[PDB]
């Protein structure tokens, strides 16, 4: 039996569902993998990749990130705490991106999707960096049904981690864009009980969360800079078979701890 995997299996069994984990130590190449290639709903975790795709576009569209977007109430949707405040002043593309990443702002995410040509445009960006797994085909708040066996609006922990590495540490973005993406992730406000809860306080973390809620479905992915080490990239996703099964932040943190423990 896979002895590395046993504690993850116990964790998911106690949770009442399935947990998917992939973690990469970018310094040694070591990995920890559990259900790493299975699909899980993205939920709001797509918004990190959204911001990266906008940054990529901004490399060749001069002043895109600086452009004020003047939107009206028709653009607002539930859980848009940043964009509700700028109906008469607008937000720049950079500000919308920070709101989508750091507050999971739904209206901001939809405005940014428009800049890419919709969910298909984000999916095409992901294909362009070599991610064949990511799929997104709805706008907020229509991508979160998380129905078991529906591959729409899903990715895998492994593909999420691989793409996150390319974008935050590798060469998929030009350096000033890579750096902005990292700084947005580091300022996330919604992840304090997930991967951030699994690391020492002195280790820097950038992350993006998602919580479909139904079907026990929630997630987090992160880049972690342990003191004195190369960074770790990891993703933790959950789901469960019944619509009213509850997600758990504690399970996500616990899986992240096991991942860090299993790395060399």
Swiss-Prot record:
GO terms for biological process: beta-lactam antibiotic catabolic process; response to antibiotic. GO terms for molecular function: beta-lactamase activity. It catalyses: a beta-lactam + H2O = a substituted beta-amino acid. It holds the Pfam family Beta-lactamase2. A beta-lactam binds at residues 44, 47, 79, 104, 106, 209, 211. InterPro entries: Beta-lactam/transpept-like, Beta-lactam_cat, Beta-lactam_class-A. Its EC number is 3.5.2.6. Keywords: Antibiotic resistance, Hydrolase, Plasmid, Signal. The active site is at residues 44, 142. Not inhibited by EDTA, inhibited by clavulanic acid and tazobactam. Inhibited by cyclic boronates, including vaborbactam and bicyclic analogs of taniborbactam. The keyword Signal applies. Initially two different KPC beta-lactamases were identified from two different Klebsiella (KPC-1 and KPC-2); they were later shown to be identical. Belongs to the class-A beta-lactamase family. Class A beta-lactamase which confers resistance to the beta-lactam antibiotics, including penicillins, cephalosporins and carbapenems. Acts via hydrolysis of the beta-lactam ring. Has penicillin-, cephalosporin- and carbapenem-hydrolyzing activities. This is Carbapenem-hydrolyzing beta-lactamase KPC-2.
């Amino acid at each position: 039996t896979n002895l590395v995997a046993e504690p993850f299996a116990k964790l998911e069994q106690d949770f009442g569902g399935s947990i998917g984990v992939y973690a990469m130590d970018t310094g040694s190449g070591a990995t920890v993998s559990y259900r790493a290639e299975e699909r899980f709903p993205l939920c709001s975790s797509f918004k990190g990749f959204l911001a990266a795709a906008v940054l990529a576009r901004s490399q060749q569209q001069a002043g895109l990130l600086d452009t004020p977007i003047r939107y009206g109430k028709n653009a607002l949707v539930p859980w848009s705490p940043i964009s509700e405040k700028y109906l008469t002043t607008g937000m720049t593309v950079a500000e919308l991106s920070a709101a989508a990443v750091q507050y999971s702002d739904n209206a901001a995410a939809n405005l940014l999707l428009k800049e890419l040509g919709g969910p298909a445009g984000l999916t095409a960006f992901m294909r362009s960096i070599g991610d064949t797994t990511f799929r997104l085909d709805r706008w907020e708040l229509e991508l979160n049904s998380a129905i078991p066996g529906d591959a729409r609006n899903t990715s895998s922990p492994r593909a999420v981690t691989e793409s996150l590495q390319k974008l935050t540490l590798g060469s998929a973005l030009a350096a000033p864009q890579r750096q902005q993406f990292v700084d947005w992730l580091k300022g996330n406000t919604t992840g304090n009980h997930r991967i951030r809860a699994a690391v020492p306080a002195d280790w820097a973390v950038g992350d993006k969360t998602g919580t479909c809620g139904v079907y026990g479905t929630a997630n987090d992915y992160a880049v972690v800079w342990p003191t004195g080490r190369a960074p770790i990239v990891l993703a933790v996703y959950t789901r469960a078979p019944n619509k009213d099964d509850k997600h758990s932040e504690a399970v996500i943190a616990a899986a992240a701890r096991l991942a860090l423990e299993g790395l060399g």
